[PDB]
Design a protein around this motif. Sequence first.
Motif, short mmCIF file in Angstrom:
data_model
loop_
_atom_site.label_atom_id
_atom_site.label_comp_id
_atom_site.label_asym_id
_atom_site.label_seq_id
_atom_site.Cartn_x
_atom_site.Cartn_y
_atom_site.Cartn_z
N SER A 1 41.63 28.25 22.49
CA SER A 1 42.39 28.80 23.63
C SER A 1 42.14 28.00 24.91
CB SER A 1 42.09 30.29 23.84
OG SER A 1 40.97 30.60 24.58
N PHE A 2 43.23 27.78 25.64
CA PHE A 2 43.17 27.13 26.94
C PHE A 2 42.34 27.94 27.91
CE2 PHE A 2 45.44 26.17 30.98
CZ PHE A 2 45.32 24.79 30.95
N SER A 3 42.49 29.28 27.85
CA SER A 3 41.68 30.15 28.69
C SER A 3 40.20 30.03 28.39
CB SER A 3 42.14 31.60 28.52
OG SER A 3 43.52 31.73 28.80
N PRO B 1 47.99 30.15 26.58
CA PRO B 1 48.17 28.80 26.01
C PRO B 1 47.00 28.42 25.09
CG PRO B 1 48.29 28.75 28.38
CD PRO B 1 47.74 30.11 28.02
N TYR B 2 47.30 27.53 24.14
CA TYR B 2 46.28 27.14 23.18
C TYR B 2 46.59 25.77 22.60
CZ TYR B 2 49.70 28.76 19.71
OH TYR B 2 50.86 29.00 19.00
N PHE B 3 45.56 25.16 22.04
CA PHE B 3 45.71 23.96 21.25
C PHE B 3 45.54 24.35 19.79
CE2 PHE B 3 43.91 22.65 25.34
CZ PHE B 3 44.71 21.58 25.70
N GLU B 4 46.42 23.88 18.95
CA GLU B 4 46.38 24.25 17.54
C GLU B 4 45.98 23.09 16.63
OE1 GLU B 4 49.99 25.28 15.04
OE2 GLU B 4 49.03 27.25 15.29
N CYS C 1 45.59 17.98 18.24
CA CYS C 1 45.79 19.42 18.12
C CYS C 1 46.77 19.83 19.20
CB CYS C 1 44.46 20.14 18.28
SG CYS C 1 43.16 19.72 17.12
N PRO C 2 48.05 19.97 18.90
CA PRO C 2 49.05 20.05 19.97
C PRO C 2 48.92 21.30 20.82
CG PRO C 2 50.14 19.45 17.89
CD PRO C 2 48.65 19.74 17.57
N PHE C 3 49.35 21.14 22.06
CA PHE C 3 49.39 22.23 23.02
C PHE C 3 50.61 23.10 22.84
CE2 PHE C 3 50.14 23.55 27.62
CZ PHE C 3 49.00 24.26 27.76
N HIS C 4 50.39 24.42 22.95
CA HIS C 4 51.42 25.42 22.83
C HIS C 4 51.25 26.49 23.90
CE1 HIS C 4 52.76 23.96 18.97
NE2 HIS C 4 51.49 23.89 18.64
N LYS C 5 52.39 26.95 24.43
CA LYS C 5 52.43 28.02 25.43
C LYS C 5 53.33 29.08 24.86
CE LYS C 5 53.94 26.62 29.23
NZ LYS C 5 54.30 26.10 30.59
#
Length: 92
Positions: free
Chosen positions: A17-19, A6-9, A87-91
């Motif tokens: 990166s969420f990680s 997962p990440y924020f773009e 910065c929206p979240f994406h999985k």
Amino acid sequence: AAMADPYFECSMNTAVSFSGIIFYEQSHEYLDAEPGDPEGPNGEIYPARRFTRVRRDGSDVLILIQSLDEYPLRRAYEKTEQGWRLCPFHKP
């Protein structure tokens, strides 16, 4: 097979990166909000950290990571033109 990532773009396809955020949290605490930081939907004030990122084109951006009780328990903004931009979240 898939791999969780997962990440924020932010703009210019600038992924946070969420990680990487989880690793950062293990050794840095969130700090008090600064004036003008985005509030929550009922006026909540959130702890946060901010940092500078160099983008692919060589420009710099200021990124704000807030800690809050909304899934996925962090949200991200970039400082713009003109104020904060999500910065929206994406999985994937």
